[PDB]
Scaffold this active site. Structure first.
Site, PDB file in Angstrom:
ATOM      1  CB  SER B 153      -0.899  -0.033   1.263  1.00  0.00           C
ATOM      2  OG  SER B 153      -1.733  -1.180   1.272  1.00  0.00           O
ATOM      3  N   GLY B 154       0.535   2.272  -0.768  1.00  0.00           N
ATOM      4  CA  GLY B 154       1.380   3.466  -0.883  1.00  0.00           C
ATOM      5  C   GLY B 154       2.486   3.445  -1.957  1.00  0.00           C
ATOM      6  CB  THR B 158      -5.193   4.251  -4.580  1.00  0.00           C
ATOM      7  OG1 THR B 158      -4.495   5.444  -4.313  1.00  0.00           O
ATOM      8  CG2 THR B 158      -4.860   3.406  -3.373  1.00  0.00           C
ATOM      9  CG  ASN B 196       2.239   0.667   4.389  1.00  0.00           C
ATOM     10  OD1 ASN B 196       1.393   1.530   4.623  1.00  0.00           O
ATOM     11  ND2 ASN B 196       2.561   0.303   3.169  1.00  0.00           N
ATOM     12  CB  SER B 199      -0.655  -1.925   5.513  1.00  0.00           C
ATOM     13  OG  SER B 199      -0.488  -3.173   4.906  1.00  0.00           O
ATOM     14  CB  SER B 200      -5.033  -2.909   1.743  1.00  0.00           C
ATOM     15  OG  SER B 200      -5.472  -1.617   1.409  1.00  0.00           O
ATOM     16  N   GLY B 418       1.810  -7.577  -2.118  1.00  0.00           N
ATOM     17  CA  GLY B 418       2.840  -8.492  -2.585  1.00  0.00           C
ATOM     18  C   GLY B 418       3.308  -9.348  -1.388  1.00  0.00           C
ATOM     19  CD  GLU B 420       2.937  -7.570   5.679  1.00  0.00           C
ATOM     20  OE1 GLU B 420       2.491  -8.162   6.692  1.00  0.00           O
ATOM     21  OE2 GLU B 420       2.362  -6.593   5.156  1.00  0.00           O
TER      22      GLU B 420
END
Lengths: 139, 730
Positions: B153-154, B158, B196, B199-200, B418, B420
């Site tokens: 995420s980031g 998005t 993060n 994070s999703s 991806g 982790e």
């Protein structure tokens, strides 16, 4: 080399002495060899100099007697043409391409060195007859 | 050979990971060192990676590099990103997208128009190219498409989603309702982890629905892989899902007085990480955003307040404390504030709830349960309510994104993490990485199919299977299955599970290893790398048995309509497995397209490429192993005309035939003797790795020799002219 040649080479060598001590710099050695008719690569010149470090290349001074063995060592056409044909098949080479390769590959030359030798040899399209150019720089 | 004077190599470097160096002397067999110029003596008998020739560098597709290895990929992405401000690069079919941390004017109408109607390959890499190919194949194949946007995420997932959608909308207010739902989905699905801030912890699939004439009619969100464990447990420096902190920071808002919230450190379920606050984030402000977004997506104000009542209830529920009573039973203290509030908010009878939090049915006696069992049950309840709330919220977001027009086809954008890997990996990371093994299998099979097809087209006659890793994880007697088995044993523990893992898998499966100095950890060789998991907490995180009578009490509520609306041993790991199987069925019934988003630095710096971070990201997203697989085959692929054009200077006049193709064939077979190093296709020569680089070296050698000859002659001539000038007295 006989005495006459040594006298002639020495006279030429003495013209390159910019300090008056009968000596040239290491960095001038290559220029004197070329002025006397040799065409050594820079690598060859550095080899006969003993592959000097930046410091001794810029400040070590040699008299004619020390220079001489180096000149000797350096001293001891169909390929030249083919070499130009690499960059061609109408017997021409772009002045722009030759300028680029001479300043970016091999023992790179300055743009000014390249401009000097290339002056007057390229036509209106910007093409050099290299067989003609080759004879000229070999003369 | 290839390690000659002039030849360049990459060597290890602490700061830049890899650093360039030229062979200051020719490598001879038997040499123990390389003579290199960054001068330095490099002590080896594996030689360092070779650096690609300049003509292959900065190209649009990484698989056109002849030496296809990690430093070449790093260097190529770097120079494109920094020197040309190119964030997109292909890696075969994969679009690699490097976050520039800068709004780039590359997404406008004019650019959408230039990508529309073009082929994949004729345009410079862009998210639009992928979106076009998906649009194009949708109509051409009459087949649903998936754009799988992977990465942390980031890293820019998005934005990629935003412009895939903006694109589809243009070439064909869907994009804005979907984006309006982002604050909702981040509040309930994202969390601050140690690495993060946002994070999703779930996979989000936005099916962009197209009618019969491929106009966008609307969207459908499906969600998968929600990290249920996080609802009731956080590790150090981690938070629960954002919405809980949004709610707690809003505790003094008048309209929430009845929720009776404390700050985030008040509640067991939000306080465990000791990180109530994320730097730069105002959770009260994000709550405002969340509510606005809820309003924008058609969720009435009563229902919003119900969402928050239910979350507040989860939070008070988590504070319910059990007393151990005689014979390993338990009870809830009289007038227990957490329970009273919970029962008030949910509208259920205090005594009926307190009874069923400490008892179960066994049929038909009413057995007391122990404190540990009551806690586990209470957690399972919290997780169950959360998961169903989450699904409710999603169902209702969907009511706003759905269209009345019937759907003929869809392109789904999967936003997925991806691999982790932290220093300490637990069940959360294990699940993520499992998900990644499954996604990677689909990718590998896809690529292998595209490769067969390419080889067939060119008339030319290796598959890296990760099924064994998948089996080690998910098959009977695998890691997750053993975890389930250990969880239903009353004396089970992490330590006995660890040993069951060793007993079952150590020395029987090469993908499974045990650390030398630990009997409380295991190591899986996953697709991209080895990962070590700590066994601690796996059992409790896996447990998820919800007690039916507790649910019945909630189902019986008469204070608000939302709560009943939400509603072998059940385990988190098995539910993850099922969700992941559901995700793969959804994706496998489409044609996938792959975007890997990478964060190039840790500080949100505009166009700043940190090599250590980039190398880690490229690995986590699968790219470096995908490159290694590509580098094993015939990655270099040149048309006969490209080969003719580039390598003409290598040809004798004699063998330059009118048949330019036949010329290439005759010349190549004399330049590279070993015919196993390349394959002649119909329109293209396929080369093993290193072959194009080798051709560039002899070509370069030819040019270097010719040049030095010319330039030493020029130097002679110049000096003779100067000499004549100095002789004349100038």
């Amino acid at each position: 080399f006989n005495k006459d040649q040594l006298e002639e080479f020495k006279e030429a060598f003495e013209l390159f002495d910019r300090v008056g001590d009968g000596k040239i710099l290491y960095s001038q050695c290559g220029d004197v060899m070329r002025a006397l008719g040799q065409n050594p690569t820079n690598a060859e010149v550095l080899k006969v100099l003993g592959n000097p470090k930046s410091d001794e290349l810029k400040s070590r001074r040699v008299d004619f007697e020390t220079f001489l063995p180096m000149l000797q060592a350096v001293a001891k056409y169909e390929d030249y043409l083919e070499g130009f044909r690499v960059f061609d098949g109408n017997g021409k080479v772009m002045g722009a391409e030759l300028r680029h390769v001479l300043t970016t590959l091999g023992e790179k030359m300055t743009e000014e060195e390249v401009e000097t030798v290339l002056a007057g040899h390229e036509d209106s399209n910007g093409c050099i007859n290299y067989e003609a150019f080759l004879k000229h720089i070999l003369s | 050979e290839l390690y000659t004077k002039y030849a360049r190599v990459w060597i290890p470097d602490p700061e830049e990971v890899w650093k360039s160096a030229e062979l200051l002397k020719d490598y001879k067999p038997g040499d123990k060192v390389l003579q290199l110029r960054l001068d330095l003596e490099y002590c080896l008998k594996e030689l360092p990676p070779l650096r690609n020739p300049d003509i292959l560098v900065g190209e649009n597709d990484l698989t056109a590099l002849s030496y296809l290895h990690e430093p070449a990929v790093l260097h190529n992405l770097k120079v494109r990103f920094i020197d040309s401000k190119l964030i997109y690069t292909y890696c075969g079919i994969v679009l690699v997208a490097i976050n520039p941390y800068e709004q780039l004017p590359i997404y406008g109408e004019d650019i959408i128009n230039a990508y529309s109607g073009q082929n994949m390959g004729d345009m410079d890499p862009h998210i639009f190219a992928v979106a076009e190919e998906a649009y194009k194949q949708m109509a051409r194949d009459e087949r649903n498409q998936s754009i799988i946007v992977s990465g942390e995420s980031g890293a820019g997932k998005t934005v990629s989603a935003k412009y895939a959608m903006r694109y589809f909308a243009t070439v064909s207010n869907v994009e804005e309702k979907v984006l309006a739902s982002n604050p909702i989905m981040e509040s309930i699905g994202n969390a601050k982890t140690t690495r993060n801030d946002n994070s999703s912890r779930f996979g989000k699939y936005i099916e962009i629905g197209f009618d019969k004439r491929y106009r966008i009619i609307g969207a459908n969100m499906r969600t998968y892989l929600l990290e249920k464990s996080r609802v009731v447990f956080q590790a150090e420096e981690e938070r629960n899902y954002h919405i809980f902190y949004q709610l707690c920071a809003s505790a003094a808002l008048p309209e929430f007085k009845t929720l009776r919230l404390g700050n985030a450190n008040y509640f067991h379920y939000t306080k465990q990480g000791g990180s109530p606050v994320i730097d730069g984030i105002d959770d009260a402000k994000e709550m405002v955003n969340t509510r606005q977004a809820c309003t924008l997506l058609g969720i009435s104000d009563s229902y919003q307040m119900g969402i928050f009542r239910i979350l507040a209830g989860i939070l008070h529920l988590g504070n319910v404390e059990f007393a151990s009573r005689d014979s390993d039973s338990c009870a809830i203290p009289p007038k227990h504030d957490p329970l009273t509030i919970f029962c008030d908010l949910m509208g259920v009878d205090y005594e009926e709830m307190a009874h069923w939090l400490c008892h179960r049915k066994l049929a038909t006696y009413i057995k007391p349960i122990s404190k540990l069992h009551a806690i586990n049950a209470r957690d399972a309840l919290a997780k169950h309510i959360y998961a169903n709330l989450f699904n409710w919220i999603v169902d209702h977001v969907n009511k706003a994104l759905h269209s009345t027009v019937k759907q003929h086809s869809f392109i789904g954008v999967l936003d997925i993490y991806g691999f982790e890997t932290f220093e300490i990996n637990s069940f959360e990371q294990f699940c993520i990485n499992y998900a990644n093994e499954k996604l990677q299998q689909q990718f590998n099979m896809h690529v292998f199919k595209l490769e067969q097809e390419e080889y067939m087209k060119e008339q030319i006659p290796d598959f890296y299977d990760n099924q064994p890793c998948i089996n080690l994880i998910e098959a009977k007697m695998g890691v997750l299955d053993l975890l389930d088995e250990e969880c239903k044993m009353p004396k089970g523990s992490d330590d006995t599970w660890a040993q069951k893992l060793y007993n079952t898998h150590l020395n029987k499966c090469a993908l499974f290893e045990k650390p030398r100095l630990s009997n409380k950890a295991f190591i899986i060789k996953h697709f991209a790398d080895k990962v070590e998991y700590q066994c601690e907490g796996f059992l409790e995180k896996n447990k998820d048995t919800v007690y039916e009578e507790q649910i019945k009490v909630l189902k019986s509520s008469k204070k608000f309509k939302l709560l009943p609306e939400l509603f072998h041993k059940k385990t988190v790991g098995h539910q993850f497995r099922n969700s992941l199987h559901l995700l793969m069925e959804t994706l496998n019934a489409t044609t996938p397209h792959y975007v890997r988003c990478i964060k190039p630095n840790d500080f949100k710096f505009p166009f700043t490429f940190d090599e250590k971070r980039a190398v880690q990201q490229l690995r986590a997203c699968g790219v470096l192993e995908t490159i290694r697989i590509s580098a094993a085959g015939f990655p270099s692929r040149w048309t006969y005309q490209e080969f003719f054009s580039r390598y003409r200077v290598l040809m004798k006049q004699k063998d330059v035939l009118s048949d330019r193709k036949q010329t290439c064939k005759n010349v190549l077979e004399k330049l590279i003797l070993d015919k196993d190093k390349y394959q002649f296709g119909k329109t293209k020569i396929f080369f093993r790795a290193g072959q194009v680089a080798y051709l560039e070296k002899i070509r370069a050698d030819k040019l270097r020799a010719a040049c030095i000859r010319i330039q030493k002659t020029i130097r002679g001539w110049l000096m003779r002219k100067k000499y004549m000038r100095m002789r004349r007295g100038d």
